[PDB]
Each structure stands twice: as structure tokens, then as C-alpha cells.
């Protein structure tokens, strides 16, 4: 009766709000893919304006 109350309370934080620090962690992978496209643009739009202007 007593341990059935304290087994719920160790799910209050362990997989409910400490799991969201893992959810706030893997959405820097949404922010790192936007930076990757900036350099992908910054190297195309400085060279595709060059190696097509030659032709």
C-alpha cells in the first residue's frame, strides 16, 4: 500500500520531465540543419553565379 504510492512519484520526474530534457536536446537537430543549408546556399550562390557566367 505504501510502496504503491512511492512507485508512482518516481515516474513524476524520471520519464515525464527528465525525458523532455532529451526532447529539448534533439531539436537542436532542427537548428543545425538550417545552418547547413545556409552554407549550402552560400557556396552555390557564390560559384553557380561564376561557373555559369563563364558559359
Amino acid at each position: 500500500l505504501s510502496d504503491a504510492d512511492v512507485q508512482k512519484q518516481i515516474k513524476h520526474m524520471m520519464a515525464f520531465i527528465e525525458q523532455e530534457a532529451n526532447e529539448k536536446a534533439e531539436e537542436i537537430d532542427a537548428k543545425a540543419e538550417e545552418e547547413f543549408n545556409i552554407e549550402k546556399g552560400r557556396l552555390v550562390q557564390t560559384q553557380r553565379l561564376k561557373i555559369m557566367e563563364y558559359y
Binding site: 531539436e27 532542427a30 537548428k31 540543419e33 538550417e34 543549408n37 545556409i38 546556399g41
Partner: protein
């Protein structure tokens, strides 16, 4: 029911069962010929038949094999006790018992037909009752394409029990029972709203405690200028749903490209310092999109705005993308510098916006290639860099330099520099 409402619900049935053209009927019941009579031209033909066969399959006693052949007051007052006040277990009961003549789970192909049988009729009752407040979006000869793409948006929140959404051509054949439609009317407020205006506006129950000022906004344009908008009435009933509730009543014209020129200097002059407004534009490939600003537009290099600014979409699909809080790069407005971009922008970062309108007017981009960062919003246009001809900025809710200095025009004439224009400008 309150006795203010219990008075006029029997005052609709007492006038119905006294039909003259239907001969074999009594005083306690009516038949289906007079239910397609008083509605007249306020409802389409595909709904007044479902007005019959959705009310007739009520079970009141518990013993009969199916529906009764004459609808009585007991079979009438209970169906508005299921719809106009009822709960979710009662509300979708008259959704599914409107679809098939047999009981059971209704298939996922023919709930789509009913969903395009409803939203084509809200624009039929609201136009015939003359409540459009100026928003008369022109019907297309043929099918209206905004009725179609709005109706399939509601079915995107149709969460089947599997947890996986309706994807691919296997989206038509789901045995959708009462287990799965009863959260759909719980999640989607408009399928609960639109049934309260197809029924309670042709039937003209004046005691109804609804709000029609906050469902359809009021179009406030200045008179004298013949002005049609990009957005028809089902679109402005879509964007108005995701605004704050306090502003949903009046959409005033701020800038439009076919009346105030095709200039960015006019755009930046008409939408700066006018509060929250909804920018909406349509490019060459018929992709209507845009965004909403929560605060005023102000010309400054910094990223301004807060978490109520959202991007949407209308004509390719209807979806709304709220903020994600990864960054607060919400709005942007710059007007003629050289190291930072000059134009209007929302989302993303510098030169990588999720919606951008440039100073060379009629151009822009939505370069959110995977998705956006601020708004989790896709590439909005068909291409990477679109071109547009129509733009609208709508606010929601609520001399020159040549004549400014008379000493400088005196010093310019004294210093030898001419005027270049007399008799070309007014005064």
C-alpha cells in the same frame, strides 16, 4: 431547454405537420415533402435529404428495427437535444446516423463525401440569409476549389485508432465507428460550429445563443473603389479561427496591390504603425500563402514580434503553423540599407526566411527547405523563389518633402540648382 427556447422549438414543429400538399398524414407528424418546402433556396439539395435521414434514424423506445416513416415531435425535439445542446457521445451519433442507411462503422470514403456535403452548404445558407458582411467570395462555375481543400483539412485531424494518419490511396477504406468520430467532433470545433448554422439559420430560431460576429469577420474597405480580394469567405473563415478571439470581428484593408500600386514603398507606408495585420499574397502558380503579425510593423533592423505570429496556407493546402520557440526571429522590416536585407520577412534568419517579400516588388522566397525554424513551416511557394502579382495586407480588429521646408527651396534656388518641375506637380 429553457422555456425561452422550449417555446420556439415546438413553434417550428406545429407549423410543419399541418402540411396541405401531403394528404395521408395526421396532425402529430409530418412527411418529407414539406421539410424540403420551407427551406426553399436557403439549403442545397444534397443536405435537405440528409436533413431527413439524419433525424429519422433516432431510436426512442428501443425495440424497433430501424427508422420511423413519419417524424413526430418526440423524434424532432430529441435530435436537437442531441445536436444543439448534446454532448460528444450524442453529437456524432447524428453524424454517422446521417451517412448510411445501415447501422455500423461508416467507411472513410463516404465521410469525405459528407464533409464536402457540409462546407458547400454553410456558404449557401450564409449567402441566402445575407450575413456575409462584404466577404462575398466569388463562386466558381463548376466546383468551388476552396470548398474542396478546406473539407480535407478537417479530415487530417481524423486520428484513427492505429495512431497513423490517413495517408495514400488506402485512406478511403477505414471502418470508422463511433469510437473514432467522437473525438473528431471534440478536436475540430468547426464541424461542431457549422452544424449550428446550417440548421439554426434557415429554420430562423432567433433565441440562439451563438455568435455570428466572431465566426465571419466584417470586411471594412473604404467605399468608392471596386475591390475584390484574394481570399474568399471560406479562407477568411479559416485564418480568423487561429487569431486571438478579441480581434476576429473586423478585417480592414491596409494595402492591396491592385489599388495602391505595385510598390514596396507604398506597402511599407500603408502597413507600418497600424497594429496587428494579416499579410496574404498569391504568386504565379496559384499558391496563396502569407502570415500574421501580432504587433505593429515597424521599420528597424532587429527581429521584432512575439509568439502569436504565425504563417498559414490557403490555395495549395490549408494549414497553420504556430511558433516553436527555437528562435524569436519573428518579423523583419528594412527599407533601403546595404549590409542587411531590404524587404519584409517572417521566420528563419537573414537571407533564409520562411517568407520573404523583397523591395524589388513582385519577388520573394520561402527558403524553408526541410521546414522552417521559427514556425516549423514548409516551403510555401511552388518554387524556391516565386514571383507574385496580387498582395493583400489586412488589419484585424482595431505634407511631402517638396513642400516641407520653404527655406530650403529658397536656398536651392539661390545656390543655382533648378526645380525641374513646375506645372507638373499639384499643390
Amino acid at each position: 431547454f429553457l422555456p425561452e427556447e422550449q417555446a420556439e422549438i415546438d413553434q417550428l414543429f406545429d407549423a410543419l405537420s399541418s402540411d396541405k400538399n401531403s394528404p395521408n398524414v395526421s396532425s402529430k407528424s409530418f412527411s418529407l415533402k414539406a421539410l424540403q418546402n420551407h427551406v426553399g433556396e436557403a439549403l442545397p439539395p444534397e443536405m435537405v435529404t440528409r436533413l431527413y435521414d439524419g433525424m429519422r434514424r433516432v431510436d426512442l423506445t428501443g425495440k424497433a428495427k430501424g427508422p420511423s416513416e413519419n417524424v413526430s415531435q418526440e423524434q424532432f425535439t430529441a435530435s436537437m437535444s442531441h445536436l444543439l445542446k448534446g454532448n460528444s457521445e450524442e453529437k456524432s451519433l447524428m453524424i454517422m446516423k446521417m451517412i448510411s442507411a445501415t447501422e455500423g462503422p461508416v467507411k472513410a470514403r463516404e465521410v469525405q463525401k459528407f464533409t464536402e456535403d457540409l462546407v458547400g452548404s454553410v456558404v449557401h445558407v450564409l449567402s441566402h440569409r445575407q450575413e456575409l458582411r462584404g466577404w462575398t467570395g466569388k463562386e466558381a462555375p463548376g466546383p468551388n476549389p476552396r470548398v474542396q481543400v478546406l473539407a480535407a483539412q478537417l479530415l487530417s485531424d481524423m486520428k484513427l485508432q492505429d495512431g497513423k494518419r490517413l495517408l495514400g490511396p488506402q485512406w478511403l477504406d477505414y471502418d470508422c465507428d463511433r469510437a473514432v468520430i467522437e473525438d473528431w467532433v471534440f478536436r475540430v470545433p468547426h464541424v461542431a460550429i457549422f452544424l449550428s448554422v446550417v440548421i439554426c439559420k434557415g429554420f430562423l430560431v432567433l433565441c440562439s445563443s451563438l455568435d455570428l460576429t466572431t465566426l465571419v469577420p466584417e470586411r471594412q474597405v473604404d467605399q468608392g473603389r471596386g475591390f475584390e480580394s484574394i481570399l474568399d469567405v471560406l479562407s477568411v473563415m479559416y485564418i480568423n479561427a487561429q487569431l486571438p478571439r478579441e480581434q476576429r470581428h473586423r478585417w480592414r484593408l491596409l494595402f492591396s496591390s491592385e489599388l495602391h500600386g505595385h510598390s514596396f514603398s507604398q506597402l511599407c507606408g500603408h502597413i507600418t504603425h497600424r497594429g496587428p495585420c494579416v499579410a496574404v499574397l498569391e504568386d504565379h502558380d496559384k499558391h496563396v500563402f502569407g502570415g500574421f503579425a501580432s504587433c505593429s510593423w515597424e521599420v528597424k533592423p532587429q527581429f521584432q514580434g512575439d509568439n502569436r505570429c504565425f504563417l498559414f496556407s490557403i490555395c495549395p493546402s490549408m494549414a497553420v503553423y504556430t511558433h516553436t520557440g527555437y528562435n524569436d526571429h519573428y518579423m523583419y522590416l528594412n527599407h533601403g540599407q546595404q549590409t542587411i536585407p531590404n524587404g519584409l520577412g517572417m521566420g528563419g534568419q537573414h537571407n533564409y526566411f520562411g517568407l520573404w517579400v523583397d523591395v524589388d516588388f513582385g519577388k520573394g522566397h520561402s527558403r524553408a527547405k526541410p521546414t522552417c525554424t521559427t514556425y516549423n513551416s514548409p516551403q510555401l511557394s511552388a518554387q524556391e523563389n516565386f514571383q507574385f502579382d496580387k498582395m493583400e495586407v489586412w488589419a484585424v480588429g482595431d505634407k511631402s518633402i517638396l513642400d516641407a521646408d520653404p527655406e530650403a527651396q529658397a536656398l536651392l534656388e539661390i545656390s543655382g540648382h533648378s526645380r525641374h518641375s513646375e506645372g507638373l506637380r499639384e499643390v
